[PDB]
Subunit: 185 residues, 4 copies
């Protein structure tokens, strides 16, 4: 289906998602000046978002996340109800480290997208093709030449690498990947 | 393609996988009584396998894994050559913990297969359907009712569970999963 | 220590204190209906709505639950009827590097992860024994997995030789994860 | 400590010892052509075949490399021509729970993982401060994530109140992983 370019969330009316609801797509510090008045139920189609008990954002919050929230009890283990007054999307910080290898130079064709997780045989994660291009989004990676990080070593830090010509290889042969994980200087 | 029911590995002859090779599918404590004589190169189509320098299995081993091993230097960072004499498959011990949720009772239909990794919104790992069956292969899991492991709790230990009727739920509603990870008794 | 849970009388840990170290089907009548707290000193356990460990459930991990409002992210249950220690299927991959031989002095316990270099872990000593508890590992000579490989698998390695190490040098250890067949 | 590498004269750490704490383009001529060892006391660094840091590479992590046979899982290189400290992009998600207020005494550092219960981690004390370094976390009241939620995000929380805690109770912390939009 279509992939949202922003947070979504349809706080309802009759609970159980029955009837009469409004979709809010970004901060909304109140809820009367909303099609709705009292937080009926909640449907989250892309989050996460963080609530509040007191409009203008203060009070006992709650963290809603993709899924269905069928009724008041539903987003408060607290049994402390009096619904939804503030609704802000959580703009979550998340730290991944990605190197993405490419089939043919110029970063096109079949790729092998790896993250944090280190990989020894590219041949076993299903990639089989030669490796000619690479775009290092983050982390410090050290791509070997055979499986079990053995043979020829190549350092691969932040920056796209278009050819072995600029990523120091003879045969565009990287069987394995390793992430450097620690410094001490 | 077809999924092997056993280890594979075609130690070759002319290096670079050129010419004249033999496929070994299980322990083979020697290599003359092989189409081959001297470990030319190695192609592994399903491993891992562990070698040796001295037939009958003793000496300086090496661990080959899916991928191509183009020439002697290739599976020895040691530069200590004199090829392959013993070839045994590694029958690796690996410990995963799996709970696998099901769409319709009787463990059929759309499933959500989770491992070690805990999951909060099933709705966000792409599963959307109700949850009526479950087969707990391992680990100690505690499946909630909404996202963020909230609402109703269900314990789910080793054993298949055919209905809420036997897995204690009212509405076949498990939005989240959690693995118990530690004991202290 | 076997399971240790303390059922109290009322909120905020006041009054009636009792311990428990095993299952309990009708604790409700064993002398406990005033369940207005819960302390776990070792578990995890499980509570119930009804008794005989049947009914909507709850799980206790360890530490305080001042009011029923922790175990019932609601209130649609009954009053704590039964209890029961939980049995945890938790697998781990433990290798343990013994500096001296036959398990002595310096020691490195590795649990699931890959170690490109022992030095940075504080391990600067030789290696002579290796008693593998789970999983398939393979020990390198120098760090970064370069050098001599040493499959190390479920079992005991008596000496560096006892696992093909000419010299007792092993600076790296990494888990073998997959199985292709 | 800045990068610290010691280039030696010959095998097994014998002879000529030199330290290094920065890059070095032609160390080969700086007085070092007899590269028959390498000790890393802090890195990681990188070697080269040729000089100017150009040529087939190698990486040193920390601890001993008695003979060229570690850095060259071959021998198709030149003799150690340049060196250079490495810059590591390593992200972590650190939350740190300060027992007293304004950062004092007991403290819990959490790095990436989910903590269903602090008690089992040894943390049995209240909470009053929380200085979040990375990632989006959310603090529970009781353990198992039941109770009061507290988004805790990049920044400093001065007191339990300073992050909506009526009472300074927080037994669980779990990372928020996804972003849907």
């Amino acid at each position: 289906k279509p992939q949202p370019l922003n947070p979504k969330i349809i706080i309802f009316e009759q609970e159980n998602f029955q009837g009469h609801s409004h979709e809010l797509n970004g901060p909304c510090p109140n809820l009367k000046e909303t099609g709705v008045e009292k937080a009926g139920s909640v449907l989250v189609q892309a989050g996460p978002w963080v609530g509040y008990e007191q409009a203008n954002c203060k009070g006992e919050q709650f963290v809603f996340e993709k899924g269905e929230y069928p009724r008041w009890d539903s987003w408060t283990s607290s049994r402390r109800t009096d619904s939804l007054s503030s609704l802000r999307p959580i703009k979550v910080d998340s730290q991944e480290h990605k190197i993405t290898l490419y089939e043919n130079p110029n970063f096109t064709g079949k790729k092998m997208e790896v993250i944090d997780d280190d990989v020894p045989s590219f041949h076993a994660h299903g990639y089989q093709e030669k490796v000619s291009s690479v775009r290092v989004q983050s982390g410090t990676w050290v791509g070997y030449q055979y499986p079990g990080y053995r043979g020829l070593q190549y350092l691969l830090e932040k920056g796209d690498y278009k050819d072995s010509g600029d990523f120091g290889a003879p045969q565009p042969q990287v069987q394995s990947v390793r992430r450097i994980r620690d410094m001490q200087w």
